[PDB]
């Protein structure tokens, strides 16, 4: 017969996290301190005031891949597919609008030209201009602004 | 076409010619079981049917 070499030392894939779960440590340390003959550690003394979140069940017990257990590790983009397509089309038509906001690193405290372009596109859409014409008009407005800037630079 | 026992003997002899104990010692080797040098002895008293020596 054939067996993997490390099959004997293979960790249990269903109960290897319950040992390291924070709540187990919290409860055990609470009981140990409440016995009255154990000096509480600093981590217990701090986390008794701020206990961890309750709803962070691991995927091992959840057995549901589409469950976002960890809010910190959650990765779900807020952009709808329509918004993604719109901004991708705008960036593909003009690389200036896409790169102008970001450049080497995302400056999160300044206005984004792509955001302004999307806002103007939405305004044109609700005014009555359809997709292609609205995109062309907003791009031409951005180019007019850039032309003003370049004219000032030349002067 | 050769028989199995002759093939085995020939292969063993050829491997011996072409080509451990201290690393691994089993209970038989330790207690002198497999060793053909060690042989039990008999009782010194002489029998009656055995042909006299010389």
């Amino acid at each position: 017969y054939k067996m993997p070499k490390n099959m004997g030392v293979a960790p249990r894939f269903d109960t290897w996290n319950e040992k390291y779960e924070p709540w187990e440590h919290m409860k055990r340390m609470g009981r140990l301190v409440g016995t009255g003959f154990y000096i509480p550690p600093e981590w217990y003394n701090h986390f008794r005031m701020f206990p961890p979140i309750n709803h962070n069940f691991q995927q091992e017990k959840t057995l549901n891949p589409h469950n976002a257990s960890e809010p910190t590790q959650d990765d779900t983009s807020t952009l709808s597919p329509e918004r993604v397509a719109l901004r991708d089309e705008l960036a593909r038509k003009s690389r200036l609008v896409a790169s102008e906001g970001m450049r080497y690193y995302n400056i999160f405290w300044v206005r984004k030209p792509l955001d302004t372009m999307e806002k103007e596109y939405y305004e044109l859409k609700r005014r009555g201009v359809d997709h292609g014409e609205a995109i062309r008009k907003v791009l031409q407005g951005f180019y007019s602004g850039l032309a003003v800037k370049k004219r000032v630079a030349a002067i | 076409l050769t028989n199995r026992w002759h093939r085995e003997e020939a292969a063993k002899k050829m491997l011996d010619q072409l080509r451990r104990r201290f690393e691994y010692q089993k209970m038989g080797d330790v207690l002198e079981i497999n060793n053909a040098k060690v042989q039990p002895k008999g009782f010194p008293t002489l029998t009656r049917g055995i042909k006299p020596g010389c």
């Binding site: 055990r28 009981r31 140990l32 409440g34 016995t35 | -």
Partner: protein, 48 residues
Amino acid sequence: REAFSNIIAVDLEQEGPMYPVRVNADGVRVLLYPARRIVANFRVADIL
């Protein structure tokens, strides 16, 4: 050292369980129940 690493403790305000708890560590079925006195085998009673 392993025992001190895996040491545990319980809440003694009750001095005994208030509900039957049934588990099994390595197939050995263990039942702990409330009782008037400490009634169990000598070794487990000494552990309790």
